[PDB]
Write a protein that binds this ligand. Sequence first.
Ligand code: CLA
Ligand code: CLA
Ligand code: CLA
Ligand code: CLA
Ligand code: CLA
Ligand code: CLA
Ligand code: CLA
Ligand SMILES: CCCCCCCCCCCCCCCCCC(=O)OC[C@H](CO[C@@H]1O[C@H](CO)[C@H](O)[C@H](O)[C@H]1O)OC(=O)CCCCCCCCCCCCCCCCC
Ligand SMILES: CCCCCCCCCCCCCCCC(=O)OC[C@H](COP(=O)(O)OC[C@@H](O)CO)OC(=O)CCCCCCCCCCCCCCC
Ligand SMILES: CC1=C(/C=C/C(C)=C\C=C\C(C)=C\C=C\C=C(C)\C=C/C=C(C)/C=C/C2=C(C)C(=O)CCC2(C)C)C(C)(C)CCC1
Ligand SMILES: CC1=C(/C=C/C(C)=C/C=C/C(C)=C/C=C/C=C(C)/C=C/C=C(C)/C=C/C2=C(C)CCCC2(C)C)C(C)(C)CCC1
Lengths: 40, 40, 75, 75, 143, 141, 31, 81, 729, 52
Amino acid sequence: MDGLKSFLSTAPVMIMALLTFTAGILIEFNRFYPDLLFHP
Amino acid sequence: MDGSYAASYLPWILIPMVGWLFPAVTMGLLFIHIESEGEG
Amino acid sequence: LSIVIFHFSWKMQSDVWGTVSPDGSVTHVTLGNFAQSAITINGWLRDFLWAQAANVINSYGSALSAYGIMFLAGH
Amino acid sequence: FGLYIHNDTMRALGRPQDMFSDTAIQLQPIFAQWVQHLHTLAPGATAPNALATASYAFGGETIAVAGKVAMMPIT
Amino acid sequence: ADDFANLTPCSENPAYLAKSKNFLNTTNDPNSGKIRAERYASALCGPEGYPHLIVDGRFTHAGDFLIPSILFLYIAGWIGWVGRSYLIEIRESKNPEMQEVVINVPLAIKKMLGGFLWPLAAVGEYTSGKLVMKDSEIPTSPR
Amino acid sequence: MTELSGQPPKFGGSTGGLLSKANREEKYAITWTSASEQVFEMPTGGAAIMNEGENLLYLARKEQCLALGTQLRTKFKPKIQDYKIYRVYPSGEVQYLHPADGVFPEKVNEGREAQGTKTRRIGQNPEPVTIKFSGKAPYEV
Amino acid sequence: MALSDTQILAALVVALLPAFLAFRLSTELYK
Amino acid sequence: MSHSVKIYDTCIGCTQCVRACPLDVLEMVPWDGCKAAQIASSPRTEDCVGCKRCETACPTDFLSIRVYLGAETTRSMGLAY
Amino acid sequence: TKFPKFSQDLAQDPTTRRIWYGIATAHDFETHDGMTEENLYQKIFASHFGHIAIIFLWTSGTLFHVAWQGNFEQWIKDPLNIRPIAHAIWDPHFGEGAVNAFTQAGASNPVNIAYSGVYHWFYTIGMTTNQELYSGAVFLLVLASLFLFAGWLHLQPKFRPSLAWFKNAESRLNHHLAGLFGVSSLAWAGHLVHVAIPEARGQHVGWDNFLSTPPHPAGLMPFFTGNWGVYAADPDTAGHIFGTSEGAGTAILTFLGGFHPQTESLWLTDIAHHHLAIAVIFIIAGHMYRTNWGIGHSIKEILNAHKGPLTGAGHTNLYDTINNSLHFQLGLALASLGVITSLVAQHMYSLPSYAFIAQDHTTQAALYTHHQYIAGFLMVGAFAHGAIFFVRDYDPVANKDNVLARMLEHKEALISHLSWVSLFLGFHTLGLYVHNDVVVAFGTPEKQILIEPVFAQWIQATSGKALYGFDVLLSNPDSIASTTGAAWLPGWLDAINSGTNSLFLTIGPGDFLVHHAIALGLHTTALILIKGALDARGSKLMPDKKDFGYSFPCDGPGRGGTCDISAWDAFYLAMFWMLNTLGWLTFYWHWKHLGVWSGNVAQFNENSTYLMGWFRDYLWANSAQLINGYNPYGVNNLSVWAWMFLFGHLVWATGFMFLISWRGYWQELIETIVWAHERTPLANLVRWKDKPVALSIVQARLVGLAHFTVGYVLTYAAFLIASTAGKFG
Amino acid sequence: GMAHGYFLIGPWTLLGPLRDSEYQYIGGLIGALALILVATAALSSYGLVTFQ
Ligand code: CLA
Ligand code: CLA
Ligand code: CLA
Ligand code: CLA
Ligand code: CLA
Ligand code: CLA
Ligand code: CLA
Ligand SMILES: CCCCCCCCCCCCCCCCCC(=O)OC[C@H](CO[C@@H]1O[C@H](CO)[C@H](O)[C@H](O)[C@H]1O)OC(=O)CCCCCCCCCCCCCCCCC
Ligand SMILES: CCCCCCCCCCCCCCCC(=O)OC[C@H](COP(=O)(O)OC[C@@H](O)CO)OC(=O)CCCCCCCCCCCCCCC
Ligand SMILES: CC1=C(/C=C/C(C)=C\C=C\C(C)=C\C=C\C=C(C)\C=C/C=C(C)/C=C/C2=C(C)C(=O)CCC2(C)C)C(C)(C)CCC1
Ligand SMILES: CC1=C(/C=C/C(C)=C/C=C/C(C)=C/C=C/C=C(C)/C=C/C=C(C)/C=C/C2=C(C)CCCC2(C)C)C(C)(C)CCC1
């Protein structure tokens, strides 16, 4: 309901969600392309 | 404890004088001074 | 509690834990050094902290490297 | 802590005989040693139906499993 | 012709080769160490055999700091610009604080999406007056 | 000022009470009239029993007497707004302290002379350099 | 060569002068 | 000795400082500078300890009552001995 | 009570605080009761005389103890293999082991070895016997007597200087440049040319003969004519052996750069020539200002004439702003002196002037650390007295619109951009360090972000360092900067291109990372100090802070809470960051020179990139000998340093107590203790003359910082000394 | 003073540095005499300051 939405939209939930999304992105990018110390 | 330098009998009595007598006397003078209740 | 756990670790490594021989000789972890070293603060700094910290600092390039990392992290 | 500071100063000055230690000015934990001895003598005496001591840290044999020592007296 | 004489390319350093023939695998791929020994060979190493980077500005090492600088500055400009526009928009919603602690997800996602043009919008707000405010219209403390 | 009356509260004793200062330097007294024998918190630790009628109590500090006074006037069924606080010197001299002119200071009263008044804002104090090598600070001028 | 006892004792007498002058400067700065 | 407690002309006469003061340093006296027709006063600063409860209480944009700590006495140091 | 007599307020304090504050405010003459400006300047003048005299007496003690209980004459013979001793030990606490351990360096009684480099100094300047050192110390006794008597005399009314005499900036600048700096440097060049340089060549020149033995065979004839090149003459040969005439030259003024081949220090003739040139320039500069003959500049007119369209009023009235603020003057003196003290530290280890001091690694480490710490204290004090200026002396109407006031006008911009640079540096330097740590931990040290310090290497090349191959300026023979025929260029290049000294030490990624750590430290300490100085007059939490003085406890728990609000608190906080910065810089210096002296530069080069290398390879390892100064097996001469190491740890941790736990808890505990005393019979016979109270809030901050700093300095000093001495470089 | 000086012999006598010399009792005595002298100075200073 509206209260559950307003809770899931709170600042800690959203910041942890974005941190999780970004961590997934970085971890996977380093999984498929590791050890990029610099660009060739 | 000894000394082969000139007049090596001087630390013999100066070390007690600097470590015991000098601090005792100066602390006693400063003590009687900071506690002095003479008006002014 | 830091002092309590340091006492426990050092006493157990000095006067308890160790290796027994088929003859029965007991070679303790730190060779029974508690009685003469744990009586001075320099003894605790050298023979306890400095000596036994050798594993945490050399833990890099090994499976225990996360322990040295968390060591620096706690500092 | 003052005893530790005294021992650090005495050892630094090259005066080990003036230290607090088992080999100089001894401070023996007399009561704890007495209680350890009472514990050791409990099985068969004050603990008739107890075959062995409650904990070998109070004294007795040096129980060892595998190459390591499981538990032994803690002086 | 003889610049950076204290460094030699990793393909020419024997220490780097002896260490790269034992490079540890990074992921589940058992060729990641060989991929490292291949990739890092083009940069400059040194006596210890570890690759050294050149932030000097010369384009022969443009990949050592220039390209990453561009990438980071783009992403960080996007982040700050969309957050700032979110804050500005929310300011005139009667109760900006509550919307700062409880996010306005529609508006937030909308501002985030429109962040790929953040340098253009930055220049456009500079040429107007939305970017920088005037000092006499800003609170200060006593001198 | 004259003499002080009142019965000491029912109490067995505390370590928080008067010290050598009370006899050597100064002391404070608080009197109040209670409607019944009721328990109250002793500002020096513990619970004491005030008596019906007049009660006189000696405390070490003026702030202790004022804390007891606030407790009397805020924590009791019929409120006690009757307490008077005096400063007692070892010479026997008694000095009436609170409430000054018979009226609590929270409410205004005629015949009171303003003190500490400054006919300007805070931001209108002079610059310290303008008053250096005097003995004054910008609030004292 | 090594300093003599006479040289050590002569320097203490000389140091009696800065002692008196430091006492005087101290007590005057107290004023 | 004692601290110094000054009352400035931004006083609105809300009296909260007098109620906050735990040593009876302050009073309310009649004034004509504010609507409440009253201004705070510090006629007993020799008892003032300097705990700053008045300043905590003052509502005016920056305090209309200001406590400047000064020479320390046994009364000002809150000493019971 | 009487004490303190300069403060009625403190004098009437009935608590122990009276004592403490009486000690803490003695030298703040401006806030004494009844203080006038003229009496202020006069008291400061006499205090200055006393301080100079104390300095002279200290130097006399150094000379006297080296001459009496040292091994100077022996050390002169074999200065690379003999350790110089400072003074004899007399401690009835010593046992046999310590007595044996401290009869060292050839001595026949317990002794400490000197690390002040004073032997090298006295030997280089021409002193060779204990009799010379003793005569110097007696002369310094006399000089101190003269300055003490002068200080006493200038308190006498007839010799009391007027305020206008103290405020004559032009005459004092003229005299201090031409006379205090100029003629002193000239006289020192004369000593070098007359005594030190002849002594270095096997000749004796003292008061018995210096009249009848010229410094040069030609003597003054070339000086008063043209022909100055005669004094550049034949210099000491590369084979010159210090103290003998073997390979010795006759020149007195040269410019051949580099180092003496045997003593690894600047050539004495170069030093004499430097002092002569500096003397000329300072004497010329000491004529700039107007005094009694119409010619000369008015500083006021110069400052008033420098206004721009973009700086408002310019420097108008800055002459009075500075001439009337002793705190402005003191802040300027402190900042400038701290800068040049760091300069001394950086140049003495790199371009030493005393014979054989470069091979004495413990003295080099100790002197560098000493001067850097002095510089840090001086810088912090400079900014603290700038804040005190803003609090007590700044005038807004006279300084209106000038550069001084304009600095306050945009103080928020300054403070915010200092915050930003500190955050930039901290975030990224810590991030690179932690990346390197993690990447080396997991067994893949090849993935380290190693930035080559190309800019400092390129600067080294511009001065001639060919190692990097930049071929710029002095590293390129074709350069117009190197095709000049400069007489110093061959020697300078020969010195800077041999990897055998500390002249522009080779640098790498470790130096890059520590230099950014240094930049972070400097910026954060400057940010704290500048935020404190610019907000000392007022902020929004305290718009009237100038009415509360430089130092005060706080403003209470209201308005959100105001702990550490005063600018004094900003000083106190900045002290921690200064100590941290100096820790980083001295760690860098000591570890790098440990590698340099040991020949193993690879350790620092490869392990200074991650912080675990700093932890184990620098701190943990080099403690081994230090920490074994005393152990269950015996005692060696490192026992003092081990005990001092522990002492510093203890003092530091003790200061933690005052910093962390604040005051009210202690006042309540002291009240329980007061009750315990007043009720214990027999003890009741005795009563305190001052009421015991807890230390004040500011007093707590200061005492905790004092313990922190004492422990800091002593810990690191014991570590540095013991590690470098046990390893011997 | 009789009581205090009598019992102040023991500590150094049995535990001071001269305990293991041929001057054990003399060392204890010397320590006690110095301690009583310092204590006398303290007593007299207290009296000098408290009864002005
Ligand atoms: C704070 C400073 C800092 C910096 C400078 C770095 C830098 C780096 N680290 Mg490191 N690290 C740090 C801190 C830091 N780290 C810390 C604190 C730790 C401890 C946790 C570590 C521990 C660590 C480990 C364990 C590893 C690294 C690794 C790396 C490298 C991997 C880079 C990469 O390819 O990732 C990803 C590359 C990207 C480009 C991701 C960005 C993609 C975005 C999301 C897309 C945007 C593109 C955009 C649409 C294009 C538009 C263009 C525009 C012009 C229009 C890199 C050079 C890895 C390595 O092997 O080093 C070589 C590695 O394994 N680091
Ligand atoms: C095409 C090859 C490939 C393969 C072999 C895998 C294999 C795997 N992935 Mg991966 N992944 C891939 C592509 C691939 N992925 C790509 C292209 C991306 C970029 C978007 C990712 C991003 C990614 C993430 C973020 C995660 C995985 C995870 C996993 C594991 C669990 C799979 C799963 O669905 O569980 C469950 C799946 C998820 C929890 C996330 C699904 C990933 C989607 C695409 C992104 C959704 C995240 C969301 C938008 C923001 C995060 C908020 C959070 C609350 C979810 C699995 C072994 C999960 C894992 O590592 O387990 C611990 C995981 O968290 N992958
Ligand atoms: C400030 C310089 C200085 C310093 C730091 C020292 C340090 C020391 N001296 Mg020495 N001394 C000095 C100058 C100094 N001396 C001079 C100039 C002389 C010749 C007069 C002597 C003659 C002397 C003798 C005969 C002996 C020592 C001894 C000692 C050691 C024990 C302390 C003592 O008994 O001193 C006693 C000092 C004196 C009797 C003379 C006074 C010293 C000067 C003139 C006064 C210094 C005042 C000072 C600047 C005030 C500033 C203090 C500051 C905190 C405000 C000690 C390490 C003893 C020793 O060698 O130990 C083994 C020893 O027996 N000193
Ligand atoms: C030629 C005349 C002359 C000379 C010699 C001096 C000399 C001096 N004056 Mg004075 N003055 C003069 C004229 C003169 N004045 C006149 C005419 C006036 C009135 C206008 C004043 C009014 C005045 C006042 C009000 C005061 C002084 C003070 C001082 C002293 C400064 C503090 C100090 O000792 O530092 C000495 C500085 C140097 C030796 C040179 C600086 C060294 C630089 C910074 C770097 C070091 C170089 C080198 C590397 C060092 C080698 C290190 C070594 C260990 C190897 C100093 C000795 C102050 C003082 O202390 O009073 C007693 C003070 O209060 N002067
Ligand atoms: C170099 C010239 C110089 C001059 C002459 C002054 C002059 C003055 N300063 Mg300033 N200052 C200086 C440098 C200077 N300072 C430096 C280098 C710093 C940075 C540390 C400061 C920072 C500073 C602050 C923050 C303040 C002053 C203040 C003052 C005034 C009061 C002085 C006083 O009575 O305190 C007396 C000092 C003490 C009681 C403490 C002495 C500490 C000792 C020396 C250290 C103890 C070491 C320890 C015992 C060692 C044990 C060794 C053992 C364990 C082996 C005074 C006019 C105060 C003031 O009044 O503001 C206007 C003030 O608040 N100064
Ligand atoms: C190792 C101890 C330590 C650290 C890390 C800091 C950190 C900092 N201090 Mg500080 N300080 C310290 C001790 C320390 N202080 C002490 C003992 C004192 C004396 C009381 C001071 C007093 C002091 C003052 C007075 C000031 C500072 C300032 C600063 C900031 C300077 C900017 C900077 O460094 O760049 C960037 C910051 C950092 C590198 C630190 C953050 C590191 C984290 C790990 C970054 C990553 C975030 C992390 C992942 C968060 C997730 C948490 C989650 C996992 C639970 C910085 C945040 C100055 C300031 O405020 O700057 C504007 C300032 O004015 N300090
Ligand atoms: C670390 C602390 C310390 C240490 C090491 C010592 C050490 C010592 N104490 Mg001391 N003591 C201490 C603390 C300490 N004390 C304290 C805190 C107190 C309480 C204040 C005492 C009070 C105390 C007393 C009263 C005496 C000692 C005595 C002694 C010595 C007894 C051992 C001995 O020599 O055998 C030999 C012991 C004796 C020969 C006992 C003396 C017998 C005489 C003749 C009394 C006879 C009793 C009778 C009433 C005669 C009175 C005659 C009269 C009517 C005219 C010993 C060296 C004794 C001593 O000083 O030896 C003379 C002793 O008399 N202690
Ligand atoms: C964050 C702030 C942002 C912005 C604000 C910044 C402001 C500025 C701040 C700092 C700026 C620092 C300085 C930057 C410039 C450095 C210059 C530099 O590095 O140059 C580096 C270059 C390097 O190239 C040089 O080439 C020369 C060839 O002869 C040199 O001799 C060397 O071989 C070689 O090093 O040096 C030069 O500048 C070349 C100068 C050549 C011409 C010299 C003109 C003067 C001399 C004329 C002839 C004199 C005598 C004739 C000879 C005999 C007859 C008598
Ligand atoms: C190593 C990096 C250093 C970091 C410092 C901080 C970086 C931030 C940049 C500061 C910009 C300040 C804005 C000024 C605001 C401004 O633009 O004012 C405009 C001003 C014009 O005023 P006028 O010069 O006309 O005023 C006449 C003068 O008599 C009064 O100033 O121009 C300047 O002042 C240029 C100098 C600014 C640079 C400050 C000097 C910094 C280093 C000085 C080195 C001295 C060397 C002396 C050798 C002889
Ligand atoms: C007639 C006259 C002139 C002739 C002058 C003659 C014929 C001789 C002049 C000699 C001079 C002017 C000697 C000056 C000596 C000054 C000294 C010695 C100053 C200071 C020493 C200090 C401050 C302390 C030094 C220290 C000592 C004591 C140490 O031992 C350790 C080092 C250090 C701590 C530095 C000429 C024709 C020219 C000009 C016209 C007038
Ligand atoms: C607070 C305040 C203040 C301040 C303080 C301070 C502390 C300051 C500072 C500052 C500083 C601490 C600064 C520094 C600086 C530096 C500089 C300014 C430098 C310069 C340089 C140059 C220019 C060089 C060049 C060169 C080179 C690089 C090499 C080659 C040669 C040449 C020469 C070319 C005052 C009191 C005043 C006032 C009041 C307020």
